[PDB]
């Protein structure tokens, strides 16, 4: 299963909302998760099964989608949100990461 993420990078100001998308090469039955990878930290699971927020994760993170098309959003951007985000499909007992999206903050 192939995953294509978009955009590859973006720059946004604090307080705003950003949205990233991911497209699979086949129906992955909403079995998609989103990870945040901050430099110096290990990857962190934020959302799974398309829209389910991982316990302990801020509600500023959300997801939506179905079939082959999915979206992930970060509302009220904070400085600590600067990182690379990845979608991850986990259907058919396999894992496939999207190419990643580097999010940079502006001030």
């Amino acid at each position: 299963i192939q995953m294509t993420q978009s955009p590859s990078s973006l720059s946004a100001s604090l307080g705003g909302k950003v949205t990233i998308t991911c497209k699979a090469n086949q129906d992955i039955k909403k079995k998609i998760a989103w990870y945040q990878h901050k430099p110096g930290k290990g990857p962190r699971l934020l959302i799974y099964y398309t829209s389910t927020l991982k316990s302990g994760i801020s509600s500023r993170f959300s997801g939506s989608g179905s079939g082959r098309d999915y979206s992930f959003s970060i509302s009220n951007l904070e400085p600590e949100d600067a990182a690379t985000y990845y979608c991850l499909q986990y259907d058919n007992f396999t894992w496939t990461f999207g190419g990643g999206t580097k999010l940079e903050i502006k001030r």
Binding site: Y35, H37, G42, P43, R44, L45, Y48, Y49, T52, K54, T84, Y86, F93, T94, W95, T96, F97, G98, G99, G100
Partner: protein
């Protein structure tokens, strides 16, 4: 309380092999999958494979079949990944991780450098 303790850095010559390990602590090692992921310099995360210690089942990224071999030792709660016939492109940071609806824990990551 939960942690995945990853093994140290490695240096190997072309054609050689190395075996990385990850010891789990804080959760039932035999009822969850453990993943192995690669990240080459300046590149994104890549899935290598997964193993379910409870029964030994393994799943591999087609790209890594023939390169990576996953095993597990339930008595020591340790999962291992062997990289065979090492080459330049294998130089990267490798992570072990238990990541699912019930918990998200990653090893600190370890480097494998392949050079003559």
């Amino acid at each position: 309380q939960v942690q995945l303790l990853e093994s140290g850095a490695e240096l190997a010559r072309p054609g050689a092999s190395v075996k990385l390990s990850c010891k789990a602590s804080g959760y039932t090692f035999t009822t969850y999958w453990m993943q192995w992921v690669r990240q080459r310099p300046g590149q994104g995360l890549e899935w290598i494979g997964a193993i379910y210690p409870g029964n030994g089942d393994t799943r591999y990224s087609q790209k890594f079949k023939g390169k990576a071999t996953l095993t597990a030792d339930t008595s020591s709660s340790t999962a291992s990944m062997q990289l065979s016939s090492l080459a330049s492109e294998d130089s990267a940071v490798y992570y072990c991780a238990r990541s699912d609806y019930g918990g998200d824990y990653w090893g600190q990551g370890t480097s494998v450098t392949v050079s003559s």
